[PDB]
Amino acid sequence: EKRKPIRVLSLFDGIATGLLVLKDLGIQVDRYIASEVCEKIMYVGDVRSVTQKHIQEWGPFDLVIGGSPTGRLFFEFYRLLHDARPKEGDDRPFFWLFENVVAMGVSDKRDISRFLESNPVMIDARYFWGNLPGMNRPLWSVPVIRHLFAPLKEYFACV
Amino acid sequence: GSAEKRKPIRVLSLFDGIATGLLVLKDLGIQVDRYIASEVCEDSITVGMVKHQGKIMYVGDVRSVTQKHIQEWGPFDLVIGGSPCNDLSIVNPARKGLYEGTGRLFFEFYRLLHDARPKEGDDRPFFWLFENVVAMGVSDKRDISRFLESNPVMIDAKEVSAAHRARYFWGNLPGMNRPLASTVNDKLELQECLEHGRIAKFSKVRTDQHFPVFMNEKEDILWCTEMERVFGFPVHYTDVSNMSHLARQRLLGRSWSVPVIRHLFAPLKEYFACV
Amino acid sequence: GSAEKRKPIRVLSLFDGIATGLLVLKDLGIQVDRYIASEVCEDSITVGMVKHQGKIMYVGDVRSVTQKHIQEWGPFDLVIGGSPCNDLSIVNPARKGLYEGTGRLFFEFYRLLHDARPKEGDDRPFFWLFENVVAMGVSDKRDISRFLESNPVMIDAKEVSAAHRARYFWGNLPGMNRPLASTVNDKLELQECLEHGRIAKFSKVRTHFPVFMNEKEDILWCTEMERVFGFPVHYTDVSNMSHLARQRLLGRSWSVPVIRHLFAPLKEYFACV
Amino acid sequence: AEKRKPIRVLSLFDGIATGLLVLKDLGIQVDRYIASEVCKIMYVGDVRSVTQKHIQEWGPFDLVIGGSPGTGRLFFEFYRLLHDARPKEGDDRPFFWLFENVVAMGVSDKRDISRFLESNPVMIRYFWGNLPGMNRPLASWSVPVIRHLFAPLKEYFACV
Ligand SMILES: Nc1ncnc2c1ncn2[C@@H]1O[C@H](CSCC[C@H](N)C(=O)O)[C@@H](O)[C@H]1O
Ligand SMILES: Nc1ncnc2c1ncn2[C@@H]1O[C@H](CSCC[C@H](N)C(=O)O)[C@@H](O)[C@H]1O
């Protein structure tokens, strides 16, 4: 019931973008685990090696971020999301973000919006899906993720 | 470890095809509470609609099914599915893989399965089955096994039928890898599947330059009824809706082998009501 | 007026189609000694050869059967036939008539019948049946009746089935004009012939779109037409035939209950199971 | 097996009195000549009015002729008359027939007529018949032609 430092799971293409944005906002970090798709802050290698058991042991996680500024990188992210989400009945704050380029298949955008149950924020240009306050939508990339992540200051401890 | 009357089974069937799951469950004597099927091909929907007398509740495209739908229509005891394989098969040179094309339909399964399983603390029996081809990329198979947290069982219908048909089966059904029982009911040879006045060249048939049957003086391919027997279906199972022989052969070519599904489903008799 | 054991019936079927005659004879319990069929359509031959387990002896084009063949293959007790009608039907404006085109095929029947008739002094029972359409020219009907020395009986399958099909039957079968029995097997309504989840617009089909399904208009399915003409379901589900080929085979066929009505008095002449 | 008797003729020929003139040219006695067209020497009108019973009553017949110097109607009416007038099995009495048509006919028509009559035609016009001399192997108005064709009839029937 009190503000604690954030714990992060990153499938982002830039393994350190999330940590830099978080420290840029002054948010304390108790955990930051980075992974990549290829083909305690910690690098864990291929996402193909991260099992659900690893997600359990390293967790709990408060933030899950992924994407890159083809669709294989989304579903992997999706998997991690599913494995890191709080179970039903747990109301603790949990947030996620997924970025991709606007130049994508219209089918890809529709599929991602369906799977995430959310419509994207367009920023001229990139697409950003998330459940942060302000990313609710109808129907480098560092400072923009900073502004999008700003509401995390009202949920986790700041230094 | 508690006592209760065994209840009929509730099934969610994605990519249902010609309703092999319901046919097999009925043949095992398992009572079916409800059977919700997701399918888009109108020929397959007509087959399942006719041959099972409107028991199936069709819900259309698997991508039109939300988690809210799974909760409101559920609970489900059995979630089964065999997604399209044209973008997974190494035979296709234009295959887009598991993550693109029609391959990503697999994730819909992965999606709805997760929406359908019981919440933590619910010890109710819950079973699932996902089927696909053996001849896919090693990376595709590895990734499917990663997402399902299960390693597949390889079963070939040739052991229990007259068809060469090796498939991967992921799932938590009891005793999936157990040996298959060969009974008298199974037609192990192609000759047993042919119509009167036809001779089989080989023992088993493969799904060129081969017409598998001789009729009098000429060569010939299999008839629709003969493939129905080859795949284990009742004769004339696909004889609906004026569809061409090519349409029926296509429907049967994508389907599950009935005795294989029967082998996989049989242990469900110890969990649900039986007629 | 003499005594003898009833023997199985010997049949010559010209223009046999999908072997309706053998089906009807079996359904009546009449034992069939031999069934020789003349037919040229490979789809029809396949239907008859599969559905009757090689009992039929196919002899090909009716024009390749000589009188010596009738003697050597015979004797026959029953000679049946329904010759093609495309050149007799007034619906066809290119019709060549009874004496030209495929109309003259009738005379082949007329020929073989006369080759199969018992000789003078032979009182053995001998029956024959020739069938064709009602919608032919008056002169063609008069000439068929003159060559066969018989006047036709008009029977419409609509009395014992869900199909409008009025046909002329020449022959000497006992009591061909007697009233038809509407039994319990008879599906008099098109609705009784449809598959699950389809609704019939009309009581009897005349072959627009005769059925509704899920608020969508549709033509008859193959099994539904099989029921409409009185055949067993899936009787024509052989040989990878297109749906159009099945509809063609069924559209040329005899109505099964009508042939059953016509053949039934044969039970008092031949061995029955 | 008896002495020669005058000939009895059934004519469906196009040309009502051709056969009688040819028979008189050969000096053959005629006891009966029944003439008909498709449209004791009697004309009887339309062949549609001629029945098996009329054939039996006016008969017996020794010679049946038909044709013309579509072909289907003419030939099939002739074939009906030939069948009705033919001697029954066991009757070995002399019986002959002839059918003429123009050579300008459908090939299928020629094949069908040869099949029905069980004979191959004499080309000259086409002439089918069973007279001695009209026996032919498989292929690959003016009345003296019928005169020579009918010549063998004076060895089977009485001559004036
Ligand atoms: N988007 C979609 N939603 C639901 N079903 C789909 C679909 N896309 C394809 N399908 C169906 O998925 C099926 C995969 S083949 C599986 C057939 C089934 N196992 C049987 O035994 O009959 C095909 O029939 C195809 O029509
Ligand atoms: N020259 C020929 N010799 C034998 N059969 C022929 C023929 N020409 C056409 N036929 C056949 O004669 C049939 C006439 S329709 C009669 C069908 C049959 N009464 C039934 O109930 O099924 C057609 O099937 C056609 O294939």
PDB file of N, CA and C in Angstrom, chain C residues 16-66:
ATOM      1  N   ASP C  16     -30.344 -48.950 -69.579  1.00  0.00           N
ATOM      2  CA  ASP C  16     -30.602 -49.308 -68.188  1.00  0.00           C
ATOM      3  C   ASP C  16     -30.431 -48.129 -67.239  1.00  0.00           C
ATOM      4  N   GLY C  17     -29.573 -47.172 -67.578  1.00  0.00           N
ATOM      5  CA  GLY C  17     -29.362 -46.042 -66.683  1.00  0.00           C
ATOM      6  C   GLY C  17     -28.675 -46.484 -65.406  1.00  0.00           C
ATOM      7  N   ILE C  18     -29.286 -46.168 -64.263  1.00  0.00           N
ATOM      8  CA  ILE C  18     -28.684 -46.479 -62.969  1.00  0.00           C
ATOM      9  C   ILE C  18     -29.347 -47.704 -62.349  1.00  0.00           C
ATOM     10  N   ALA C  19     -29.761 -48.649 -63.197  1.00  0.00           N
ATOM     11  CA  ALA C  19     -30.202 -49.977 -62.762  1.00  0.00           C
ATOM     12  C   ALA C  19     -31.430 -49.913 -61.858  1.00  0.00           C
ATOM     13  N   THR C  20     -32.363 -49.016 -62.185  1.00  0.00           N
ATOM     14  CA  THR C  20     -33.584 -48.892 -61.393  1.00  0.00           C
ATOM     15  C   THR C  20     -34.385 -50.191 -61.398  1.00  0.00           C
ATOM     16  N   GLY C  21     -34.395 -50.897 -62.531  1.00  0.00           N
ATOM     17  CA  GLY C  21     -35.189 -52.113 -62.628  1.00  0.00           C
ATOM     18  C   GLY C  21     -34.725 -53.192 -61.668  1.00  0.00           C
ATOM     19  N   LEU C  22     -33.410 -53.408 -61.593  1.00  0.00           N
ATOM     20  CA  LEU C  22     -32.878 -54.406 -60.671  1.00  0.00           C
ATOM     21  C   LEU C  22     -33.149 -54.014 -59.227  1.00  0.00           C
ATOM     22  N   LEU C  23     -32.954 -52.735 -58.899  1.00  0.00           N
ATOM     23  CA  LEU C  23     -33.252 -52.244 -57.558  1.00  0.00           C
ATOM     24  C   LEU C  23     -34.694 -52.551 -57.174  1.00  0.00           C
ATOM     25  N   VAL C  24     -35.631 -52.241 -58.070  1.00  0.00           N
ATOM     26  CA  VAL C  24     -37.045 -52.444 -57.773  1.00  0.00           C
ATOM     27  C   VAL C  24     -37.371 -53.930 -57.664  1.00  0.00           C
ATOM     28  N   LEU C  25     -36.813 -54.755 -58.558  1.00  0.00           N
ATOM     29  CA  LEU C  25     -37.071 -56.191 -58.490  1.00  0.00           C
ATOM     30  C   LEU C  25     -36.571 -56.773 -57.174  1.00  0.00           C
ATOM     31  N   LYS C  26     -35.366 -56.381 -56.752  1.00  0.00           N
ATOM     32  CA  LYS C  26     -34.846 -56.820 -55.460  1.00  0.00           C
ATOM     33  C   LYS C  26     -35.751 -56.370 -54.322  1.00  0.00           C
ATOM     34  N   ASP C  27     -36.201 -55.112 -54.366  1.00  0.00           N
ATOM     35  CA  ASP C  27     -37.004 -54.581 -53.270  1.00  0.00           C
ATOM     36  C   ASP C  27     -38.340 -55.302 -53.147  1.00  0.00           C
ATOM     37  N   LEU C  28     -38.847 -55.858 -54.245  1.00  0.00           N
ATOM     38  CA  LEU C  28     -40.085 -56.625 -54.216  1.00  0.00           C
ATOM     39  C   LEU C  28     -39.879 -58.057 -53.745  1.00  0.00           C
ATOM     40  N   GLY C  29     -38.639 -58.464 -53.488  1.00  0.00           N
ATOM     41  CA  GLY C  29     -38.358 -59.824 -53.085  1.00  0.00           C
ATOM     42  C   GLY C  29     -38.289 -60.824 -54.214  1.00  0.00           C
ATOM     43  N   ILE C  30     -38.368 -60.373 -55.463  1.00  0.00           N
ATOM     44  CA  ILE C  30     -38.330 -61.276 -56.607  1.00  0.00           C
ATOM     45  C   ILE C  30     -36.893 -61.720 -56.849  1.00  0.00           C
ATOM     46  N   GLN C  31     -36.683 -63.031 -56.900  1.00  0.00           N
ATOM     47  CA  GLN C  31     -35.357 -63.560 -57.181  1.00  0.00           C
ATOM     48  C   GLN C  31     -34.991 -63.310 -58.638  1.00  0.00           C
ATOM     49  N   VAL C  32     -33.760 -62.865 -58.861  1.00  0.00           N
ATOM     50  CA  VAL C  32     -33.289 -62.484 -60.186  1.00  0.00           C
ATOM     51  C   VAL C  32     -32.279 -63.525 -60.642  1.00  0.00           C
ATOM     52  N   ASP C  33     -32.672 -64.339 -61.625  1.00  0.00           N
ATOM     53  CA  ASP C  33     -31.741 -65.273 -62.245  1.00  0.00           C
ATOM     54  C   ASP C  33     -30.619 -64.524 -62.952  1.00  0.00           C
ATOM     55  N   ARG C  34     -30.975 -63.669 -63.908  1.00  0.00           N
ATOM     56  CA  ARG C  34     -29.998 -62.941 -64.700  1.00  0.00           C
ATOM     57  C   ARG C  34     -30.529 -61.550 -65.015  1.00  0.00           C
ATOM     58  N   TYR C  35     -29.604 -60.598 -65.128  1.00  0.00           N
ATOM     59  CA  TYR C  35     -29.938 -59.205 -65.426  1.00  0.00           C
ATOM     60  C   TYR C  35     -28.899 -58.689 -66.418  1.00  0.00           C
ATOM     61  N   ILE C  36     -29.256 -58.691 -67.699  1.00  0.00           N
ATOM     62  CA  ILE C  36     -28.396 -58.192 -68.764  1.00  0.00           C
ATOM     63  C   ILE C  36     -28.825 -56.770 -69.095  1.00  0.00           C
ATOM     64  N   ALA C  37     -27.875 -55.841 -69.063  1.00  0.00           N
ATOM     65  CA  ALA C  37     -28.164 -54.424 -69.225  1.00  0.00           C
ATOM     66  C   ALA C  37     -27.370 -53.855 -70.389  1.00  0.00           C
ATOM     67  N   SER C  38     -28.051 -53.090 -71.238  1.00  0.00           N
ATOM     68  CA  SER C  38     -27.419 -52.322 -72.300  1.00  0.00           C
ATOM     69  C   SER C  38     -27.380 -50.858 -71.877  1.00  0.00           C
ATOM     70  N   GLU C  39     -26.175 -50.298 -71.801  1.00  0.00           N
ATOM     71  CA  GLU C  39     -25.976 -48.925 -71.361  1.00  0.00           C
ATOM     72  C   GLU C  39     -24.619 -48.460 -71.869  1.00  0.00           C
ATOM     73  N   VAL C  40     -24.529 -47.173 -72.204  1.00  0.00           N
ATOM     74  CA  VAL C  40     -23.301 -46.613 -72.751  1.00  0.00           C
ATOM     75  C   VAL C  40     -22.644 -45.590 -71.829  1.00  0.00           C
ATOM     76  N   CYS C  41     -23.392 -44.960 -70.926  1.00  0.00           N
ATOM     77  CA  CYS C  41     -22.836 -43.926 -70.060  1.00  0.00           C
ATOM     78  C   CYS C  41     -22.020 -44.571 -68.945  1.00  0.00           C
ATOM     79  N   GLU C  42     -20.734 -44.219 -68.869  1.00  0.00           N
ATOM     80  CA  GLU C  42     -19.842 -44.858 -67.906  1.00  0.00           C
ATOM     81  C   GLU C  42     -20.221 -44.532 -66.466  1.00  0.00           C
ATOM     82  N   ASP C  43     -20.754 -43.333 -66.213  1.00  0.00           N
ATOM     83  CA  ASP C  43     -21.230 -43.003 -64.872  1.00  0.00           C
ATOM     84  C   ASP C  43     -22.363 -43.934 -64.452  1.00  0.00           C
ATOM     85  N   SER C  44     -23.333 -44.143 -65.347  1.00  0.00           N
ATOM     86  CA  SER C  44     -24.463 -45.012 -65.037  1.00  0.00           C
ATOM     87  C   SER C  44     -24.012 -46.453 -64.838  1.00  0.00           C
ATOM     88  N   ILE C  45     -23.100 -46.924 -65.694  1.00  0.00           N
ATOM     89  CA  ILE C  45     -22.578 -48.278 -65.555  1.00  0.00           C
ATOM     90  C   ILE C  45     -21.856 -48.433 -64.227  1.00  0.00           C
ATOM     91  N   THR C  46     -21.082 -47.420 -63.828  1.00  0.00           N
ATOM     92  CA  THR C  46     -20.390 -47.483 -62.545  1.00  0.00           C
ATOM     93  C   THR C  46     -21.381 -47.546 -61.390  1.00  0.00           C
ATOM     94  N   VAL C  47     -22.429 -46.719 -61.442  1.00  0.00           N
ATOM     95  CA  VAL C  47     -23.462 -46.754 -60.408  1.00  0.00           C
ATOM     96  C   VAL C  47     -24.039 -48.159 -60.285  1.00  0.00           C
ATOM     97  N   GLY C  48     -24.507 -48.717 -61.404  1.00  0.00           N
ATOM     98  CA  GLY C  48     -25.128 -50.030 -61.358  1.00  0.00           C
ATOM     99  C   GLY C  48     -24.172 -51.144 -60.973  1.00  0.00           C
ATOM    100  N   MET C  49     -22.914 -51.037 -61.391  1.00  0.00           N
ATOM    101  CA  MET C  49     -21.919 -52.067 -61.135  1.00  0.00           C
ATOM    102  C   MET C  49     -21.459 -52.052 -59.684  1.00  0.00           C
ATOM    103  N   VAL C  50     -21.458 -50.880 -59.045  1.00  0.00           N
ATOM    104  CA  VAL C  50     -21.085 -50.799 -57.638  1.00  0.00           C
ATOM    105  C   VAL C  50     -22.268 -51.148 -56.742  1.00  0.00           C
ATOM    106  N   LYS C  51     -23.421 -50.512 -56.969  1.00  0.00           N
ATOM    107  CA  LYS C  51     -24.547 -50.657 -56.052  1.00  0.00           C
ATOM    108  C   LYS C  51     -25.194 -52.035 -56.101  1.00  0.00           C
ATOM    109  N   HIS C  52     -24.870 -52.864 -57.091  1.00  0.00           N
ATOM    110  CA  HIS C  52     -25.437 -54.203 -57.171  1.00  0.00           C
ATOM    111  C   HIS C  52     -24.367 -55.286 -57.204  1.00  0.00           C
ATOM    112  N   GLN C  53     -23.114 -54.932 -56.910  1.00  0.00           N
ATOM    113  CA  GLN C  53     -22.053 -55.893 -56.613  1.00  0.00           C
ATOM    114  C   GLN C  53     -21.800 -56.843 -57.783  1.00  0.00           C
ATOM    115  N   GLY C  54     -21.682 -56.270 -58.980  1.00  0.00           N
ATOM    116  CA  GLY C  54     -21.319 -57.044 -60.150  1.00  0.00           C
ATOM    117  C   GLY C  54     -22.346 -58.043 -60.625  1.00  0.00           C
ATOM    118  N   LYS C  55     -23.583 -57.974 -60.127  1.00  0.00           N
ATOM    119  CA  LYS C  55     -24.618 -58.883 -60.609  1.00  0.00           C
ATOM    120  C   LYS C  55     -24.987 -58.585 -62.057  1.00  0.00           C
ATOM    121  N   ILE C  56     -24.964 -57.310 -62.445  1.00  0.00           N
ATOM    122  CA  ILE C  56     -25.377 -56.923 -63.786  1.00  0.00           C
ATOM    123  C   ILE C  56     -24.320 -57.338 -64.797  1.00  0.00           C
ATOM    124  N   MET C  57     -24.768 -57.914 -65.910  1.00  0.00           N
ATOM    125  CA  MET C  57     -23.904 -58.211 -67.046  1.00  0.00           C
ATOM    126  C   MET C  57     -24.111 -57.107 -68.073  1.00  0.00           C
ATOM    127  N   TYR C  58     -23.125 -56.226 -68.204  1.00  0.00           N
ATOM    128  CA  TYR C  58     -23.207 -55.108 -69.132  1.00  0.00           C
ATOM    129  C   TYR C  58     -22.742 -55.540 -70.517  1.00  0.00           C
ATOM    130  N   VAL C  59     -23.480 -55.113 -71.543  1.00  0.00           N
ATOM    131  CA  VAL C  59     -23.222 -55.569 -72.906  1.00  0.00           C
ATOM    132  C   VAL C  59     -23.044 -54.385 -73.850  1.00  0.00           C
ATOM    133  N   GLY C  60     -23.023 -53.170 -73.302  1.00  0.00           N
ATOM    134  CA  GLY C  60     -22.631 -52.013 -74.090  1.00  0.00           C
ATOM    135  C   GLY C  60     -23.757 -51.409 -74.915  1.00  0.00           C
ATOM    136  N   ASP C  61     -23.382 -50.872 -76.078  1.00  0.00           N
ATOM    137  CA  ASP C  61     -24.332 -50.196 -76.957  1.00  0.00           C
ATOM    138  C   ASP C  61     -25.421 -51.155 -77.419  1.00  0.00           C
ATOM    139  N   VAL C  62     -26.674 -50.696 -77.340  1.00  0.00           N
ATOM    140  CA  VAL C  62     -27.807 -51.521 -77.750  1.00  0.00           C
ATOM    141  C   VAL C  62     -27.693 -51.911 -79.218  1.00  0.00           C
ATOM    142  N   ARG C  63     -27.033 -51.080 -80.027  1.00  0.00           N
ATOM    143  CA  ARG C  63     -26.888 -51.369 -81.447  1.00  0.00           C
ATOM    144  C   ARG C  63     -25.876 -52.473 -81.727  1.00  0.00           C
ATOM    145  N   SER C  64     -25.120 -52.912 -80.722  1.00  0.00           N
ATOM    146  CA  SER C  64     -24.168 -54.002 -80.875  1.00  0.00           C
ATOM    147  C   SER C  64     -24.743 -55.344 -80.441  1.00  0.00           C
ATOM    148  N   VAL C  65     -26.030 -55.394 -80.116  1.00  0.00           N
ATOM    149  CA  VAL C  65     -26.695 -56.623 -79.704  1.00  0.00           C
ATOM    150  C   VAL C  65     -27.469 -57.165 -80.896  1.00  0.00           C
ATOM    151  N   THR C  66     -27.110 -58.363 -81.340  1.00  0.00           N
ATOM    152  CA  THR C  66     -27.789 -58.995 -82.458  1.00  0.00           C
ATOM    153  C   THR C  66     -28.900 -59.911 -81.959  1.00  0.00           C
TER     154      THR C  66
END
